[PDB]
């Protein structure tokens, strides 16, 4: 077996919103996982002070969106391998073996298994396609609105079915680290 990628539940984190509400703001393209830059117009934001915006008109808003691993991902994660009761594409999840046909590395599909991809749990070269987009804020105080499809890891968890330890025929128990029958 060789390791293509690992996947787990992604953590939705948003940097703090820039409003310099007289002149335009410029963002920078970053190598973050599923990094997105958008600029937004007139919101005239409020904080607890209630007045953070000189030039009540002319407003510009900056917001960024990216995903990164949830802090529990060193335990609750799935490993995708390619390798007989084993199919050509197998999925390892906490000692349970599933013969899922996961998408290839670089071919991310939102709302499905393997929507976020990285080589290791500590790897910084994370790629993701979660179909995240930014919406125009309408309420008078400051916030970021965003809509996004659900985690395909949790949806695949729901429809995983039985693992290969009860699926593989000829009465043999699948054992993990390394994969074997």
């Amino acid at each position, epitope marked *: 077996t060789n390791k293509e990628y690992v996947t787990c539940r992604f953590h939705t984190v948003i940097p703090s919103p820039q409003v310099k509400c007289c*002149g335009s703001l410029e963002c*920078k*393209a970053s*190598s973050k996982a*599923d*990094y997105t*830059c*958008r*600029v937004f117009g007139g919101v005239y934001p409020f904080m607890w002070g209630g007045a953070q915006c000189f030039c009540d*008109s002319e407003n510009t808003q900056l917001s960024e969106a990216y995903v990164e691993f949830a802090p529990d991902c060193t335990i609750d994660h799935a490993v995708a391998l390619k390798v007989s009761p084993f199919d050509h594409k197998v999925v390892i999840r906490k000692g349970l073996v599933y013969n899922y046909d996961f998408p290839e590395y670089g071919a991310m599909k939102p709302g499905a298994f393997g929507d976020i991809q990285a080589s290791s749990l500590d790897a910084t070269d994370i790629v993701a396609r979660t179909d995240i987009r930014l919406l125009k804020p309408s309420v008078k105080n400051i916030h970021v609105p965003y809509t996004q499809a659900v985690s395909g890891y949790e949806m695949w968890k729901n429809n995983s079915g039985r693992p290969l330890q009860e699926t593989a025929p000829f009465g043999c128990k699948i054992e993990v680290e390394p994969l074997r029958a």
Partner: antibody, heavy 128, light 107 residues
Framework: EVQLVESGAGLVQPGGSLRLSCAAS????????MSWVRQSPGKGLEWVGRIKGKPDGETAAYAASVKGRFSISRDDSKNTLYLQMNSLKTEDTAVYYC???????????????????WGQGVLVTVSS | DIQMTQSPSSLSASAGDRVTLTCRAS??????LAWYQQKPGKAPKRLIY???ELQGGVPSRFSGSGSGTDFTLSINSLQPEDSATYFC?????????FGPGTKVEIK
């Protein structure tokens, strides 16, 4: 306010070369996208080319009819925009503009920018 | 190349009435349309970028909305220094194409 001034245009021989200048001032020059705008008498507005910033590598895109003949050469020491055009055809007699592009969205890395600033425009005549 | 259409081309009106101007895009641009206008003998000026929100430097009577292939340019009051030729630009893929324009005049 972003100041963009054009100079260096005039009456030239067809099938030759010249060098005009767009001295950019009023912004951070090392991280802004520059584009050029061409206007025809009797037709609409035409795009020429785009260049990127210093972390991108100063690469240059171009239109369909200007590939291999136009050369944009920027320099950060004196903050001006140059255009080395060669093989002046009969369809290049126009009024040119130099523009500043601020980026509005960088969806998964690639950045898409509109046309934010503009110059006063100078006219070039390619005839005999 | 992405083709720009500009309909209509002659929408002369009076002050304070209802004028709606559109710019159809051919392929499925998400919201990347920028709205311009042109004084005669002057430089162009941008009005609305990202097709929904108002740029700083312009009054609040200009507004736009739309996504996909149909967009609008809603004018609240035709104050008589709005006599210009409105332009629309896509900035999604090269080459960036301008519309032919609409000569709106006020008499």
């Amino acid at each position: 306010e972003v100041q963009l001034v054009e100079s260096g245009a005039g009456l030239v021989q067809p099938g030759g070369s010249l060098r005009l200048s767009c001295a950019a001032s009023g912004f951070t020059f090392s991280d802004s996208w520059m584009s050029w705008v061409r206007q025809s008498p009797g037709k609409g507005l035409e795009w020429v080319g785009r260049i990127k910033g210093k972390p991108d590598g100063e690469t240059a895109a171009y239109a369909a009819s200007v590939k291999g003949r136009f050369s944009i050469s920027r320099d950060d020491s004196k903050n001006t925009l140059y255009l080395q055009m060669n093989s002046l055809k009969t369809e290049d007699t126009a009024v040119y503009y130099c523009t500043r592009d601020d980026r509005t969205s960088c969806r998964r890395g690639v950045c898409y920018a509109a046309f934010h600033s503009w110059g006063q425009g100078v006219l070039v005549t390619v005839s005999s | 190349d992405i083709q720009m259409t500009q309909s209509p081309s002659s929408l002369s009106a009076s002050a304070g009435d209802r004028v709606t101007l559109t710019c159809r895009a051919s392929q499925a641009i998400s919201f990347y349309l920028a709205w311009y206008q042109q004084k005669p003998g002057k430089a162009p000026k941008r009005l609305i970028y990202d097709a929904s929100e108002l740029q700083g430097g312009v009054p609040s009577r200009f507004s736009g909305s739309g996504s996909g292939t149909d967009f609008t340019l809603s004018i609240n009051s035709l104050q008589p220094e709005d006599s210009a030729t409105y332009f629309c630009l896509q900035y999604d893929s090269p080459p960036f194409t301008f519309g032919p324009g609409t000569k709106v005049e006020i008499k």
